[PDB]
């Protein structure tokens, strides 16, 4: 399949070179996979989700995404126009408030919730979790993300937007999950992206168009935008049978575009997510 006039990040995932505008992908499109978007919620009524999105848990009075961040991330995973895996099932877990903040205890509880809830769901091609969030180093947050991965979920997390080593942030610093840095449309490391040995992969993160609340769309920038590209790519590849939840991060790194990014510090991988379609 080919989506013309795609967002640059989708085009980038399916090309060896920057600057293209068509996203080429297998028609299976993540059908039969599920991706939990652990964030500010999802405006599940948005037409771009085509009924494939639903909220399953909140940690606040409401399940509404009063911010937009979670809806944006979910759209990069799985919306018709802005998504990597256009047929995946999306589940929303609201661990962040409408200002985009959350307590570490709530973020931990949300990960443990997903690890159990997936057993209530039909996800024959497997389960992914996208965590476009983080804060300072916490062993308890890292351990929660490790448990979620161990339980059989492909966990993708944002490296952070501190232009610093991700070793000092969580869950970015957890070794066993997939830690995602951000790039821009000219194949530069995004100016804000964290870096470091713990990164596993880069995805598009500067000026990413996706869904927004009020049935709208908008472009924003962050490692929060890179992460759902990788989460959706994992769901896509799992649906194709090319990899598993346990091995998808490694497989994505194995099959990535290598050596294309500029301003990558020594000791950080130079690997950009790629579907090899």
Swiss-Prot record:
Keyword Chloroplast part of the UniProt annotation: no
Gene Ontology terms: biological process: proteolysis
Disulphide bridges, residue numbers: 34-123, 178-249
Active site: 39, 69, 224
Keyword terms of this UniProt record: Calcium, Disulfide bond, Hydrolase, Metal-binding, Protease, Serine protease, Signal, Zymogen
Catalytic activity: Hydrolysis of keratin, and of other proteins with subtilisin-like specificity. Hydrolyzes peptide amides
Binding site for Ca(2+) 2: 16, 260
Residues reported to bind Ca(2+) 1: 175, 177, 200
Co-factor requirement: Ca(2+)
Domain Peptidase S8: 7-277
Chain ranges passing through the membrane: none
Described function: Hydrolyzes keratin at aromatic and hydrophobic residues.
Similarity annotation: Belongs to the peptidase S8 family.
Protein known as: Proteinase K
Species: Parengyodontium album (Tritirachium album)
Lineage: Eukaryota, Fungi, Dikarya, Ascomycota, Pezizomycotina
């Amino acid at each position: 399949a080919a989506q013309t006039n795609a967002p640059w990040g989708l085009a980038r995932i399916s090309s060896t070179s920057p600057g293209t505008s068509t996203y080429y992908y297998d028609e299976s499109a993540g059908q039969g996979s599920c991706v939990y978007v652990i964030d500010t919620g999802i405006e599940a009524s948005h037409p771009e989700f085509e009924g494939r999105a639903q909220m399953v848990k909140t940690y606040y009075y409401s399940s509404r995404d009063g911010n937009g961040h979670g809806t944006h991330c979910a759209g990069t995973v799985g919306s018709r126009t802005y998504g990597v895996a256009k047929k995946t099932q999306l589940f929303g877990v609201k661990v962040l408030d409408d200002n985009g903040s959350g307590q570490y205890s709530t973020i931990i509880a949300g990960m443990d919730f997903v690890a159990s809830d997936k057993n209530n769901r039909n996800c024959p091609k497997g389960v992914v979790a996208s965590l476009s969030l983080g804060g300072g180093y916490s062993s308890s947050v890292n351990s929660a993300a490790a448990r979620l991965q161990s339980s059989g979920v492909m966990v993708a997390v944002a490296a952070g937007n501190n232009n610093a080593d991700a070793r000092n942030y969580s869950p970015a610093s957890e070794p066993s999950v997939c830690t995602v840095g951000a790039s821009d449309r000219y194949d530069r490391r995004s100016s804000f992206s964290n870096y470091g040995s713990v990164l596993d992969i880069f995805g598009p993160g500067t000026d990413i168009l996706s869904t927004w609340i009020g049935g709208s769309t908008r472009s924003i920038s962050g490692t929060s935008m890179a992460t759902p590209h990788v989460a959706g790519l994992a769901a896509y590849l799992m649906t194709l049978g090319k990899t598993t939840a346990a091995s998808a991060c490694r497989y994505i790194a194995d099959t990535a575009n290598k050596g294309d990014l500029s301003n990558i510090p020594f000791g950080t991988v130079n690997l950009l997510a790629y579907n090899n379609y």
